[PDB]
Amino acid sequence: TKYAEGTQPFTVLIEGNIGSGKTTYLNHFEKYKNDICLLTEPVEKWRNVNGVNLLELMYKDPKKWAMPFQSYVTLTMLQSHTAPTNKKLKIMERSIFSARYCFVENMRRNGSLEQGMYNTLEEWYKFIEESIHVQADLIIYLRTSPEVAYERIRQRARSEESCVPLKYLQELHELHEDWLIHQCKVLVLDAD
Amino acid sequence: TKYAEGTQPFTVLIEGNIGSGKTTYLNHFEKYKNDICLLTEPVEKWRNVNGVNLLELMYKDPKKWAMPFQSYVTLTMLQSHTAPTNKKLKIMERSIFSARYCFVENMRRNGSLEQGMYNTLEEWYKFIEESIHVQADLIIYLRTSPEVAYERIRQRARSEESCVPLKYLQELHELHEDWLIHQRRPQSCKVLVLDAD
């Protein structure tokens, strides 16, 4: 009855903080393209929504753009979670779950999302749950300490997500921990 | 393959401008409750989103709340469009289509929705189209002139849409007309026009 239900192979979700080495980790699977459906985070979609860079606007003016940005993230995630494939294995960077439990909940906490906007997103999440199939068979948590994550971010000659405070990575770290450690199967890796 | 696909009976959508007499029209069908699934516009949901009145915030500060508001409307409409029922006939006040083609498009035009937010809603609409079955068998257009509607609005008790200016009702009228008469928009399903004078 749910959309995409029974159309998806064994699926693995790569979860981790900003700067936990997810892009790096996923580069290793690229030789296996032909047997593995391999979906990196759709940052490029977020940067170019018919010309508008949602990601930037979100980092620039969070109180105006958090709602639209997260709405869109959620869409692009669903678009991945549901994309048809012939391959026997599917691997995604992040998921609708990280969006809901980490990033959105964090924007609510530090006050960038007003309660009214948050609730709108949350009613959607509830409705998505009932109407779309999001296949999820195993999560690989690339665990790290906020401090180690900060390093990388700044090492990387880089761009958007680039300009985040440590307190923010701390807050995100804790949310990932609440979701992944303190309570499908979770495989924790030390990415230090 | 789409959600709710083949779970829905013959569906009628009541479209019309603000103040076109939809609420009045739909009161006539209330004696038939037992045979007819009857879904009025979920304004009460929009007024109480865990305490927050999106509808008000939207009319007070459109540039901040248009995006969240419409996103929510779209959700509630889908909730109606897909709600299970045993009845042989389903009747909705407005639809996801009026939301997309009239109200959202109008908020883009008068600049309350930024291009960026508009685009987000639009990408959703496209994805909704592909994944969630929206049953629609006949639309009943309660057609009126902006002036008659503006007047009907003025006679009623106050809150919310009351201070919608006539120019706004004009803009909305034309968008409904484009959609349901001039048929400038991608819709299938017969249209039955009624003179709501």
Q: Which domain holds residue A47?
A: 1-192
B166 membership: H or E segment, kind and range: helix B166-180
Whether the CB-CB separation of B136 and B97 falls below 8 Å is answered with yes
Between A62-82 and B62-82, two packed helices, what is the crossing angle to 10 degrees? 30
Q: Say which residue the tokens 């995006």 belong to.
A: B67
Q: What does the radius of gyration of chain A's CA atoms come to, in whole angstroms?
A: 16
Token pair recorded at residue B153: 């609005």
Whether the CB-CB separation of A133 and A4 falls below 8 Å is answered with yes
Q: Say which residue the tokens 């180690």 belong to.
A: A148
Q: Say which residue the tokens 């401090």 belong to.
A: A147
A91 vs A135: CA distance, rounded Å: 11
Torsion angle of alpha carbons A60, A49, B108, B156, nearest 10°? -80
Task: Name the β-bridge partners of B49.
Answer: B52
* Pairs across A and B, CB distance < 8 A: 80
Q: Say which residue the tokens 């419409």 belong to.
A: B70
Q: How far is CA B184 from CA A11, A72, A149, A189, B176, in A?
A: 42, 27, 52, 55, 10
Q: Print burial letters for A89-107: b (CB count within 10 Å at least 16), e (below 16).
A: bbbbbbbbbbbbbbbbbbb
User: Which one of A2, A49, A119 has the shortest CB-CB distance to B50?
Assistant: A119
Between A62-82 and B115-131, two packed helices, what is the crossing angle to 10 degrees? 20
User: Annotated active-site positions of B, please?
Assistant: 93
Whether the CB-CB separation of B141 and B180 falls below 8 Å is answered with yes
Phi, psi of A95, deg, nearest 5 = -160, 180
What amino acid occupies position A41? E
Q: How far is CA B118 from CA A27, A123, B98, B124, B191, in A?
A: 34, 20, 15, 10, 27
HSE-CB for B39 with a 13 A CA cutoff: 24
For residue A181, give the DSSP letter: T
**Order of strands across the sheet with B10-16?**
B36-39, B89-93, B10-16, B138-143, B190-195
Whether the CB-CB separation of B188 and B45 falls below 8 Å is answered with no
Exposed, middle or buried by CB within 10 Å (0-12, 13-18, 19+), for A9? middle
Chain A contacts to B (CB-CB under 8 A) = 1-4, 49-52, 54, 57, 64-65, 67-68, 71-72, 75, 78-79, 82, 114-117, 119-120, 123-124, 127, 131-132
How many distinct structural domains can be found in chain A? Answer: 1
B20 vs A108: CA distance, rounded Å: 39
CB atoms within 10 A of CB A85: 15
Q: What does the radius of gyration of chain B's CA atoms come to, in whole angstroms?
A: 16
Token pair recorded at residue A187: 């495989």
For residue A9, give the DSSP letter: -
Of B185, B175, B178, the residue nearest B18 (C-alpha): B175
Is B82 in Cβ contact with A54 (below 8 Å)? no
Experimental method: X-ray
Token pair recorded at residue B116: 């960026």
Is A116 in Cβ contact with B68 (below 8 Å)? yes
Resolution of this model in Å is 2.9
B35 vs B45: CA distance, rounded Å: 25
Token pair recorded at residue B18: 């603000």
User: Which one of A78, A79, A127 has the shortest CB-CB distance to B75?
Assistant: A127
Output the domain CATH number for residue B197: 3.40.50.300
Token pair recorded at residue B157: 């008790």
A117 vs B69: CA distance, rounded Å: 8
